[PDB]
Amino acid sequence: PSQVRQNYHQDAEAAINRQINLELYASYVYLSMSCYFDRDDVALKNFAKYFLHQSHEEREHAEKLMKLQNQRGGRIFLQDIKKPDRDDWESGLNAMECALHLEKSVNQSLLELHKLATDKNDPHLCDFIETYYLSEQVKSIKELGDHVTNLRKMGAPEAGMAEYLFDKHTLG
Amino acid sequence: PSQVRQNYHQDAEAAINRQINLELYASYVYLSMSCYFDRDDVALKNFAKYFLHQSHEEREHAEKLMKLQNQRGGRIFLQDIKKPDRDDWESGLNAMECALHLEKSVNQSLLELHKLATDKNDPHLCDFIETYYLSEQVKSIKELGDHVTNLRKMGAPEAGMAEYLFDKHTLG
Amino acid sequence: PSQVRQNYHQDAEAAINRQINLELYASYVYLSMSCYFDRDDVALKNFAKYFLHQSHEEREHAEKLMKLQNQRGGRIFLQDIKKPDRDDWESGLNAMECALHLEKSVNQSLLELHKLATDKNDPHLCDFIETYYLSEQVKSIKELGDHVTNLRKMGAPEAGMAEYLFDKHTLG
Amino acid sequence: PSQVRQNYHQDAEAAINRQINLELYASYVYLSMSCYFDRDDVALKNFAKYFLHQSHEEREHAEKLMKLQNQRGGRIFLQDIKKPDRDDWESGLNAMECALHLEKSVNQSLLELHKLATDKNDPHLCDFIETYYLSEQVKSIKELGDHVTNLRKMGAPEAGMAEYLFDKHTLG
Amino acid sequence: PSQVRQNYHQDAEAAINRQINLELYASYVYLSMSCYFDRDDVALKNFAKYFLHQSHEEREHAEKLMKLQNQRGGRIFLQDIKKPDRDDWESGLNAMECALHLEKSVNQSLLELHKLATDKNDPHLCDFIETYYLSEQVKSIKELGDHVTNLRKMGAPEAGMAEYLFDKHTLG
Amino acid sequence: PSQVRQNYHQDAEAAINRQINLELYASYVYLSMSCYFDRDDVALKNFAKYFLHQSHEEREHAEKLMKLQNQRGGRIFLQDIKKPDRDDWESGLNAMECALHLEKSVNQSLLELHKLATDKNDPHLCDFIETYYLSEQVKSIKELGDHVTNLRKMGAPEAGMAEYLFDKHTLG
Lengths: 172, 172, 172, 172, 172, 172
Prior knowledge:
This is part of a larger assembly, with six copies of chain A.
Chain A: H1 10-37, H2 45-71, H3 92-119, H4 123-154, H5 160-169
Helix pairs in contact in A: 1-2, 1-3, 3-4
GO cellular component, one term (chains A, B, C, D, E, F): endocytic vesicle lumen
Keywords (chains A, B, C, D, E, F): Acetylation, Cytoplasm, Cytoplasmic vesicle, Iron, Iron storage, Lysosome, Metal-binding, Oxidoreductase
Binding site for Fe cation 2 (chains A, B, C, D, E, F): 58, 103, 137
């Protein structure tokens, strides 16, 4: 056992490694979305900028988990980062809806992680998840929900100017 | 075909996608190395900082290739990012040697990519590879070779103070 | 032969003169587009500013080629700058599409010029074309493709608000 | 007729288009002179800078006429810009003399244009020509006459140092 | 073989060493010219300063090649720097003409070096030569050609004031 | 004889030319040492920087002698700069020892030069050597002796960490 390990259950260590992969996967998905909107036949720079920022943020979340793993004496075991389910997204609205689904999926994993930490009486892990991840996910989910709502009301993707103007105003 | 595509062979488009995956894989490997040196039983912060910086640089290289793919009218097709060949590295010297091998492997792929571009008469692609990638790889390979040389001369990993002092002086 | 001429084939000298005329012609076409959008019955100020800027940029490209011709010991032989194929353009979208066609035509000439330089083993000429022209053309073609995509999606020219809003947001 | 057109005769509109071509032609001639003095076998940097500045100024004059054409409701019809009568000028003195002849020719066209505007009772067009063109041409003609006088007195082109020193002092 | 060596042919390594000696030789020749114009019986300070600057620039070029040799894993083998063909130059014009001949000779060697790199499929070496050497040589050759042209036109060396005034104006 | 020559014996003029070659040779040797420590298999940047600085300093010494030669009315006669006795040095300690031997050899030549100047009653030459060269050589010899002493005490070259730490502390 690591000299620093204390009150860190093996299941929590394994769950953190799974969360690290999920965060890296989420970063990969956002990177794919950013590339799609940089295509000449899509050409929505702020959409590409928005998802590129999310991709970097997800990478930071994964790195923070890696720091937590080493702080508690756990050992990081990396796994393959699966490619996104699709390389050709459909529109700004569809990308936002997919991002909303992705964030809720990540949030669900964190909630399961917090439940595991609570069951193992790991208060530091519970506080770490609450302080840095649960609050961020709720904010991200709310923001994506707002974006989806506005895009739907504006008429996207059927209304051509809807995503163009949303790109300039909301994401600009 | 894309409205912007011009003198961009399909083989070059496929090769760029393969290079993008390799750059992402290289970033993943460097991230693994950075995590290893953050372990309480390794505890080499500057080694971790050095490889973390390389991981971010490799991600930037991959993103720049993605921008090139869209600029030329190609379509990005992402693939699974394979996990690093090992999660438990052995020492600062071994990590540097593995990094040196990785950089040369990436350089070889770029040289093959440049050869493909030359055979297809794609001067813009050739210039893009030369300007932003070939020069960087030579510098990175030279830097890693210098680090390996100094660590070996200092007596690492057998000499305990060798990697500690190299961490403070060269990487600090 | 001029005292400075060295490894500068006559065919390359003739090709540069042809490229100079093409660059001047491209500047003339952009000037025509800028004037069209300054008409009281078109009144798209940022469209006029955009093409006026492109016209000046094309003039700079021609002047740079003239500087290159004298640097290598070649002699500049100017030719008539043919008038643009049309004086009455149709809309912002049509002008962008025509500009996209013009840029690709200029890019094709540069690619042929680079091929000629490569066949004549003129590395300085090849590097000059790659460094200052090939990269710019790819960026210009990508930018015009993005503008055409957004204008088409917004509904131009049928949707009158499309070009007006594109004028204010993208070109403003 | 244009909604803004008022007291703008058809002949004046045609004359403005002819003047626009003449201004563009004058810019082309000055550009040719600038290139000649950039040759390695001429090498008069300030002569090249002087005529390059004149070429840009002539372009501005043409663009200002184009702005005037659209302001008054006229329609710009561009024509081929004929190449300069010669590509190989003879010396600084000869270029100045040719420039002096060119400026007087442009001035004569403007005087004819003003006479046409006066005959058609177009006070705005008359004021526009007087305010921005007639004064400039007189100044340009006087300046070129001074340059020709000094170069002739200094002994150019027979006196080798005449144009060299004139390049450094007057044009430097 | 060096741990960093990759796609670096032995012939390229030998050619670089020969180029290093040529650059050092060129620096030595320029140093000789600078000393000549510092003589009390020549007394052309700006001529001496000009050639002294060129001597330092050539030294920088040689050192940059040495850096390239070590970066690619090659080994630098220095040779005797032959003395300049003459210690007593004749005049500013003759020195410029000799410098022009020297620069073209150096340029020819670089062109041969680039051809060798191209034949060996060494894109990094080709880009290195193009980026830092071919462009500089063309500029240097053009500058020297301009200096020779002006000095000849001014009447040097028979015209006593020609080199004196050229020293003050062009080189001052 | 030169109009400025006064109390400048021919033997002194010849000796100065020999000293100029020796200074240039010393600069060449230091340049070779700097290149050696830039090798990937040596990788001692501060050692390379130290000897590169010495190479430039020796070049300045040669140029100052050339200025003195022309100042006194003598004529500079350059000779071939012989290559260094070896291209592959052995270690930091060996390079310092070789540099120490080189500096003492240069100092001995200067002492012989001063003796010749004293025998010829050339007080200006004696003062010039004392003011700018003799003091510098003693300082350089003392500095190199200190470096050799510390490197030997630290255990170099057998103790690999000795030269690494000396590179960081003394030469950093």
